[PDB]
Structure 1
Amino acid sequence: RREIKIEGDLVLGGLFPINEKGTGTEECGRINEDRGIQRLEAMLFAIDEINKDDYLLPGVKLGVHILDTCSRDTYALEQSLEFVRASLLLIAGVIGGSYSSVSIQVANLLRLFQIPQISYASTSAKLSDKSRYDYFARTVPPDFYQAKAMAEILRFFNWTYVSTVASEGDYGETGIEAFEQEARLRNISIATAEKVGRSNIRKSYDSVIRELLQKPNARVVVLFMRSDDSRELIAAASRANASFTWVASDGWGAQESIIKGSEHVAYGAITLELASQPVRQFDRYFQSLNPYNNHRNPWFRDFWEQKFQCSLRVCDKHLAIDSSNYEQESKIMFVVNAVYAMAHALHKMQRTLCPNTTKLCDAMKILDGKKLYKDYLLKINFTAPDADSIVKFDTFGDGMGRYNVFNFQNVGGKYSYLKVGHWAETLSLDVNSIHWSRNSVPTSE
């Protein structure tokens, strides 16, 4: 029964895809290093920082209850029952999840116990429906904007006949449906519309690649897809020696885990990811972690063994997370900001209900989740450790539509994602910086 239980005056729930979905039958698979472990650690880091902050909840120690979702909504629901068992360890708010289907499933349960929820990565436009997700907010924007951003990229390059591939579920389907409307407003025609996934209703990854090849004019393929699904499509494209210009949503983003080993078939890909700035203090914190000093994370040993491909053959005692094997996951800023958003809402309620103490007074011992959400959580602060670096929610509990545009390249022997553009109400690109095809040495034999 793996979890992180750290005692406090107020406890925050945490949900992270520590492990991937398991193959065939198994619930849990490999460790998700950057979107699982780093994010988990970014929450532990933010809590440690808040617990050292003299201006944010002094006298009110924040504890945690962090669980694995195994990248499955069904597994997340089971785990989320632990957060509500105390109403059937009391929970003040929940941080997570990542996948929109997980956040949706969790929200369906949490709203029944008036528990506020803040996601740091779920971008489904569905989650903006406050009549259904009345206790949900997020430091990230809805995919209404990402879809617009992608249609504007195609319109800019006159990619007027494209194919679409979407992951089944809450993220992919509504994301691509929004993209199809934006594309239609820009006289962009859709050649074929495919859906991928693990369910009984989905066609094969090879059948999807065959559908893309049956429209040879559509060389640009727009993807709104999970990471796990992006890998299976790339593998299928490889098997059929299919060549496409992939234009992918944040599900792919600037993740090297999707392209590693199949760099040639994803060359020249254009990807989006939410506009973020790395938390420098997090880099320091994360690089100091090892299996000998990190006692509070029960998944850290499995993470270490996977990351360094050894057993603790044998793991060298001086293996270290550093700039040679690590880069801050693009959405860490949102994790820290979500924990801080919850803490700021709690601090404000604390100062309103207990003005003559720093402590959790009698008037605030029984938390009013409804008031915490509506009267406090929709607040305003400058990010923790330009001009618009403020943490706030709109009327619908959403973040701002800001994205960075990336191009998958080969710099000088090394494959990476280079930032080539930005989207915030309008599209800005550095067209000269983009590489569209692999620079292969010609053959003459």
Structure 2
Amino acid sequence: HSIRVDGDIILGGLFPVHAKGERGVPCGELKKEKGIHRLEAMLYAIDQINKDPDLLSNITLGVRILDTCSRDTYALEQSLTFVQALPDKISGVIGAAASSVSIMVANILRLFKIPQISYASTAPELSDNTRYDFFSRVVPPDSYQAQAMVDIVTALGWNYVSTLASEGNYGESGVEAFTQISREIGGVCIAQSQKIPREPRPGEFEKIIKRLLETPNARAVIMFANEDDIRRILEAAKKLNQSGHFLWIGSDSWGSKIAPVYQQEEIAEGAVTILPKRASIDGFDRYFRSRTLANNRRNVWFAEFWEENFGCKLIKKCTGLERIARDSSYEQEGKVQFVIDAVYSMAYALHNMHKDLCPGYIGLCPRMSTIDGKELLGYIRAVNFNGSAGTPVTFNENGDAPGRYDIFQYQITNKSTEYKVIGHWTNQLHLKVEDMQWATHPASVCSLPCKPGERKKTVKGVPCCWHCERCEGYNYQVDELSCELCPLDQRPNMNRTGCQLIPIIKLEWHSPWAVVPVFVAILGIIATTFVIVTFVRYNDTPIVRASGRELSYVLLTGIFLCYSITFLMIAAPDTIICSFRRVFLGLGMCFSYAALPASQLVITFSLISVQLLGVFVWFVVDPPHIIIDYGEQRTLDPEKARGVLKCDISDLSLICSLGYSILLMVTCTVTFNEAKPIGFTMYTTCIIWLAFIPIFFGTAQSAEKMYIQTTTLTVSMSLSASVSLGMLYMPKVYIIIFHPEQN
């Protein structure tokens, strides 16, 4: 149950020939690929070194190879089996495969000063020169793998991921390194971090999947887990109908293995894996294919391998004549090159030490009776040679190896499925995205990029997630972070970012609510013009003399001024046209309702002069201007919020002149003719103005206010002036024009 080959310098070996026992038993079944192939590779390397005449001339290399059974306690016992004389002496040990096994064996071997070189251990914790003084490895540590994973995650644009870690030293340390690098660099945020137990209860993987489903926006999972755990996680995901939700990124524990995805292709399609660079060795293939029982009795586990390989027992009966790669499928294990490289590194270190310490001698000099551990380690750390794959093998000052990785993606096209190479990582990422075949490019982001107008509220803690909401219609967008109200006296732009020009309305000759007043004003002007023109040629007429030669003219001018008011008050509010128009308002009203030889002079000029200076007083003290009447007319919808242009003569400033003129109109109008017509005129005017209070105040405002008020005022004043002029002169005109003899 142990392989011994004699020689002058004896190296050790630890390989996982058997797997962990099911329960209460140390060793279980046989690992054909992981156990037998690697020890056969070590034996082949030793034979090549012994046969080589230019390396370790006349010096033989022996081996003492034992088994670990994938358990650290068994390997601890075997490591104690190594160091017993401290008689043959072990000069070096080819390290174990699992991280825990290597850690415990290195803990033991540091006391007795025995250099150790591993081929499959990647734990970062072994890079500490203050705790593991005599440990080296030909595979890169997991710090480089975590950095590469971060670079891949940030290269595809993802910034929201979850992590899965298998219990132990490997997965937990890898996930911790990834988390620390992510926190230091910044840019990607970790949502959840799970922990697959060593011995899970039934239904554990479904529970893990359901917990991962507590964050639908984290579709990318970083996995540092064993192949059995990967298979069971994929089985649970398939069972829960998530064939397309998750995106997988695996470590070297996934690699290019087929067992975890044997009949679960759809749930694992598009998974990204990372492996150390490696190739196949044809010499090892020929050596292994040349092995038979009659010539490979050096291996003590070879009969069990024969039985478990060809399916017989020596059921079917072994004929002792089968050959590998013919009666069964054959394929190299991926980690043969590393074992051969470790063995050759030890050989080269011994060669250099012999060259320095024992010069010009054939064989082994007496000074070299006992190999010195510390000097041997120093020589190990400074080797430089080309390995079995044509690639250099070198070490750092800590004993690690440079990080050189290849990247694979699982892809399904028609019926052929295979891990396809897409890029590499040699101190810097090189990823060809044009050859990535998912299920265009997917997405794993916490928050979508928002539209233009919002306020971005970064959540406390994680910078990756933001909740963006669109502010009200009364504000604009200052930036992606805040909103502000430009419309203090304006309106916002349609994009809720700018500030639009304010709509405004007016009464510029528009047809609605403005054509009736001018229509009646034209007729009134024509009638008054006809009356006055008829009177002009007949100033000597006896009825004209009875009415007064100039008594009529002033009145006709007054009502003509009233018509001028009723007409040119609808054009536009400005500082040129409607400015100073209210003095004409009052002038026309006072004439038409007051003027009704020198006596005429005084009673026509005195009162109009006093009222003229009065109106002049408040035209000076209260000058006109243009107003923009947004004010309280702030409609909630800006598109429905239109301003208006009006004269600076206020709402109650146009009416002030009327009251004086109203009191002047009441009775100040001064058996004979023309008396009863004046009485009828006064009665008609009184009935006209009785209803004026609701007429002149529509008490509605809204948007009709200017239109309703202007139309009511113009119509009422025009009608009153029309009746006043009419029920006194039209008749006399008819007598003058139609019947000439009645005079």
- Residues 414, 18 of structure 1: CA spacing in aligned structure 2 closer, same or farther, 3 A cutoff? farther
Which residue, 378, 392, 410 being the options, matches 2:382?
378
Give the AA of the match of 2:388. Answer: A
What SS is found at the alignment partner of 1:350?
helix
Offset of 1:376 from its aligned partner? 4.2
* Alpha-carbon contact 2:352-2:379 (below 8 Å) kept: no
Which residue, 322, 334, 339 being the options, matches 2:338?
334
* Alpha-carbon contact 1:289-1:321 (below 8 Å) kept: no
- Taking the aligned partners of 1:267 and 1:393, their CA distance within structure 2 comes to 37
Which residue, 291, 308, 326 being the options, matches 1:306?
308
Counterparts of 1:180-199 in structure 2, within 5 Å, are 180-184=179-183, 185-198=185-198
Offset of 1:307 from its aligned partner? 3.8
What SS is found at the alignment partner of 1:278?
coil
Offset of 1:385 from its aligned partner? 6.2
Alignment of 1:30 with 2:29, yes or no, is yes
Which residue, 352, 359, 373 being the options, matches 2:356?
352
What SS is found at the alignment partner of 1:85?
coil
Give the AA of the match of 2:419. Answer: Y
Specify the alignment match of 1:208 in structure 2. 208
Instruction: Single out whichever of 304-313 and 157-166 deviates more from structure 2.
Output: 304-313
Alignment of 1:147 with 2:151, yes or no, is no
Offset of 1:377 from its aligned partner? 4.2
Specify the alignment match of 1:364 in structure 2. 368
Counterparts of 1:191-270 in structure 2, within 5 Å, are 191-198=191-198, 204-243=204-243, 244-270=246-272
Q: Which has the higher strand share?
A: 1
Give the AA of the match of 1:407. Answer: Q
What SS is found at the alignment partner of 2:399?
coil
Offset of 1:186 from its aligned partner? 4.7
Instruction: Single out whichever of 75-84 and 296-305 deviates more from structure 2.
Output: 296-305
Please list every run of 5 or more consecutive structure 1 residues that lacks an aligned counterpart in the other structure. Answer: 438-445
- Taking the aligned partners of 1:262 and 1:5, their CA distance within structure 2 comes to 44
Alignment of 1:421 with 2:423, yes or no, is yes
Please list every run of 5 or more consecutive structure 2 residues that lacks an aligned counterpart in the other structure. Answer: 440-743
Offset of 1:81 from its aligned partner? 1.2
Instruction: Single out whichever of 289-298 and 138-147 deviates more from structure 2.
Output: 289-298
Specify the alignment match of 2:176 in structure 1. 177
- Residues 59, 159 of structure 1: CA spacing in aligned structure 2 closer, same or farther, 3 A cutoff? same
Specify the alignment match of 1:121 in structure 2. 120
Counterparts of 1:14-29 in structure 2, within 5 Å, are 14-29=13-28
* Alpha-carbon contact 1:19-1:29 (below 8 Å) kept: yes
- Taking the aligned partners of 1:234 and 1:27, their CA distance within structure 2 comes to 29
* Alpha-carbon contact 1:194-1:208 (below 8 Å) kept: yes
- Residues 215, 17 of structure 1: CA spacing in aligned structure 2 closer, same or farther, 3 A cutoff? farther
Give the AA of the match of 1:188. Answer: V
- Taking the aligned partners of 1:232 and 1:67, their CA distance within structure 2 comes to 32
Give the AA of the match of 1:214. Answer: E
- Taking the aligned partners of 2:66 and 2:308, their CA distance within structure 1 comes to 20
- Taking the aligned partners of 1:213 and 1:200, their CA distance within structure 2 comes to 19
Instruction: Single out whichever of 376-385 and 5-14 deviates more from structure 2.
Output: 376-385
What SS is found at the alignment partner of 2:425?
strand
- Taking the aligned partners of 1:219 and 1:383, their CA distance within structure 2 comes to 41
* Alpha-carbon contact 1:286-1:321 (below 8 Å) kept: no
Which residue, 430, 433, 438 being the options, matches 1:436?
438
What SS is found at the alignment partner of 1:247?
strand
Task: Look at both structures and tell me which one has the larger radius of gyration over its CA atoms.
Answer: 2
- Taking the aligned partners of 2:95 and 2:417, their CA distance within structure 1 comes to 31
Alignment root-mean-square deviation, CA:
2.6
Offset of 1:92 from its aligned partner? 0.7
- Taking the aligned partners of 2:70 and 2:429, their CA distance within structure 1 comes to 32
Share of identical aligned residues, percent?
A: 48
- Give deviations 1:208-264, integer Å, cap 9, x for gaps: 233223323222211112344434433444444444322111122122243334444
TM-score, normalised on structure 1?
Answer: 0.89
- Taking the aligned partners of 1:50 and 1:58, their CA distance within structure 2 comes to 10
Q: Which has the higher helix share?
A: 2
Give the AA of the match of 2:61. Answer: L
- Taking the aligned partners of 1:113 and 1:81, their CA distance within structure 2 comes to 11
- Residues 412, 360 of structure 1: CA spacing in aligned structure 2 closer, same or farther, 3 A cutoff? farther
* Alpha-carbon contact 2:422-2:431 (below 8 Å) kept: yes
Give the AA of the match of 1:331. Answer: K
Give the AA of the match of 1:157. Answer: L
Alignment of 1:63 with 2:67, yes or no, is no
What SS is found at the alignment partner of 1:196?
coil
- Taking the aligned partners of 1:58 and 1:223, their CA distance within structure 2 comes to 48
Offset of 1:378 from its aligned partner? 3.0
Offset of 1:351 from its aligned partner? 1.6
Specify the alignment match of 1:85 in structure 2. 84
Alignment of 1:325 with 2:324, yes or no, is no
- Taking the aligned partners of 1:284 and 1:330, their CA distance within structure 2 comes to 16
Offset of 1:399 from its aligned partner? 0.5
Give the AA of the match of 2:53. Answer: D
Offset of 1:131 from its aligned partner? 0.8
* Alpha-carbon contact 1:349-1:376 (below 8 Å) kept: no
- Taking the aligned partners of 1:358 and 1:266, their CA distance within structure 2 comes to 59
Alignment of 1:272 with 2:274, yes or no, is yes
TM-score, normalised on structure 2?
Answer: 0.55
Give the AA of the match of 1:248. Answer: G
| Higher relative contact order (Cα pairs below 8 Å, separated by 6+ residues) | 1
Offset of 1:169 from its aligned partner? 1.9
What SS is found at the alignment partner of 1:65?
strand
- Taking the aligned partners of 1:262 and 1:22, their CA distance within structure 2 comes to 27
What SS is found at the alignment partner of 1:140?
coil
Alignment of 1:399 with 2:398, yes or no, is no
Number of aligned residue pairs: 434
* Alpha-carbon contact 1:274-1:331 (below 8 Å) kept: no
- Residues 6, 385 of structure 1: CA spacing in aligned structure 2 closer, same or farther, 3 A cutoff? farther
